[PDB]
């Protein structure tokens, strides 16, 4: 109650503003949260403020995974997929059109009762002719 007036940017114990490298998102807090820091492969997208957390993306050659970019995952080329042992070319039959994710099998045109209008590649799916 006394504290509910301590506004965002501060905590209560007496409304001391947030320490360095600390923030408070709303008024009323009995403490400020420590700021995420963007280290190694994580680059700073938005600096920490007294009322907002730091935001991180990834250095070029990596890309963000997870809610709020909790992980940086190495890129590969179209026609590859990342593995526990690095970028591998797509096996014949499979394609990746992005710098992330897995090689996916070509479409089976026979199944939907159609011919392969155009052959696939390690970057593009086949195209079927109805």
């Amino acid at each position: 109650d006394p504290c509910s007036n301590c506004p965002a940017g501060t905590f209560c114990d007496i409304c001391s503003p947030c320490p360095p490298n600390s923030f408070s998102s709303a008024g009323g807090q009995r403490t400020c949260d420590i700021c995420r820091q963007c280290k190694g492969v994580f680059r700073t997208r938005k600096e920490c403020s007294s009322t907002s957390n730091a935001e991180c993306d990834c250095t070029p050659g990596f890309h963000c995974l997870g809610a709020g970019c909790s992980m940086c995952e190495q890129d590969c080329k179209q026609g590859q997929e990342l593995t526990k042992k690095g970028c591998k070319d797509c096996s014949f039959g499979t394609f990746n059109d992005q710098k992330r994710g897995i090689c996916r099998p070509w479409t089976d045109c026979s199944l939907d009762g159609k011919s392969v209008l155009v052959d696939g590649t390690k970057e593009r799916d086949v195209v079927c002719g109805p």
């Binding site: 995420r36 820091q37 963007c38 280290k39 994580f42 990596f62 995974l65 970019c69 992980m71 940086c72």
Partner: peptide
């Protein structure tokens, strides 16, 4: 998904 290592880094603030 691949394991955390030299190809994928986890920010332990988040993780």
């Amino acid at each position: 998904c691949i394991e955390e290592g030299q190809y994928c880094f986890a920010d332990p603030y988040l993780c």
